[PDB]
Amino acid sequence: ENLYFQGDLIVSMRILGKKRTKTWHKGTLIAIQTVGPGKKYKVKFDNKGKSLLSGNHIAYDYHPPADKLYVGSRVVAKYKDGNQVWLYAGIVAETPNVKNKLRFLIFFDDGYASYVTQSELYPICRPLKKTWEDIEDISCRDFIEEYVTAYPNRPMVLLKSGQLIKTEWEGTWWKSRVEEVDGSLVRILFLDDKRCEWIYRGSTRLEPMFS
């Protein structure tokens, strides 16, 4: 059947939609379709064509109030790639508190992690019951499931600036150094390539956590 209303969604509302590039963009909800128990949402993008999307691939174009977000909530957040900025999907790993200077910790679908403000988050409309089950990468999905279900029990390695450790990249161990610590994240310098990365202190990519 063709619907005009579905929960709090209404045909003609302005919305964010996931494109095939895995980045999220502004559009208009032009139709809602049902086929038995399933539902699909037709979006017309501003500078693109149309897509018929599932409910976990559309997001509201407003920032959620803090009482609606939990550890494990499915969101779209501002993602830094070189000097460009995109909207990319992720999972909330921490909500605002004193030890993280009132920010949200995001674990992105591709394995990266970052702290963001409430004004840099958008909630996904119809998340799955087990929110992590639509993460394509198997190693990311299994780590996030264990993290969300075990929370607040969070094993992490205590690290200080200048400390030498081994860090994983493309299947092998690399000599590396701790440059900086910011709450639950650590900035690691890869010594041969002389380039840095922000990594979660409980990640198995850090050798002390792997063992």
Ligand X SMILES: COC(=O)c1cccc(NS(C)(=O)=O)c1
User: Which residues contact ligand X by CB under 6 A?
Assistant: 107, 111, 113, 137, 139-140, 143-144, 200, 203-204
Q: Which does 53 bind (CB under 5 to 8 A by kind): Cl ion, ligand X, none?
A: Cl ion
User: Is 4 exposed, middle or buried (CB count within 10 Å of its CB: 0-12, 13-18, 19+)?
Assistant: exposed
How far is it, in rounded angstroms, from Cα 92 to Cα 109? Answer: 11
CA angle 167, 172, 179 (to 5 degrees): 20
Q: Which helix (H) or strand (E) holds 146?
A: helix 138-150
User: What is the DSSP code string of 174-191?
Assistant: EEEEEEEEETTEEEEEET
Residue from the set 3, 11, 69, 128 that interacts with Cl ion by CB under 5 A: 128
* Nearer to ligand X among residue 24 and residue 132 (C-beta): 132
Contact set for Cl ion, span 37-66 (CB under 5 A) = 53-54, 57
Q: Which does 128 bind (CB under 5 to 8 A by kind): Cl ion, ligand X, none?
A: Cl ion
| Closest approach of ligand X to the CB of residue 135, in Å | 10
Which of ligand X, Cl ion, none does 203 bind, CB closer than 5 to 8 A by kind?
ligand X
Instruction: Provide the 3-class DSSP secondary structure of residue 147.
Output: helix
Picked from Cl ion, ligand X, none, the partner binding residue 114 (CB below 5 to 8 A depending on kind) is: none
Distance CA 102, CA 56 (A): 27
Report, in Å, the least distance between residue 139 CB and ligand X. Answer: 3
CA gap 151, 148 in Å, rounded = 5
| Residue 85: CB minimum distance to Cl ion, A | 24
CB-nearer residue toward ligand X: 53 or 113: 113
Tell whether residue 129 is a contact of Cl ion (CB under 5 A).
yes
Specify the residue, 121 or 140, whose C-beta has the smaller distance to ligand X. Answer: 140
Q: Is 184 in the site for Cl ion (CB under 5 A)?
A: no
Helices (H) and strands (E) counted in the chain, each on its own, are 2, 17
Q: Which is nearer to ligand X, 117 or 204 (CB)?
A: 204
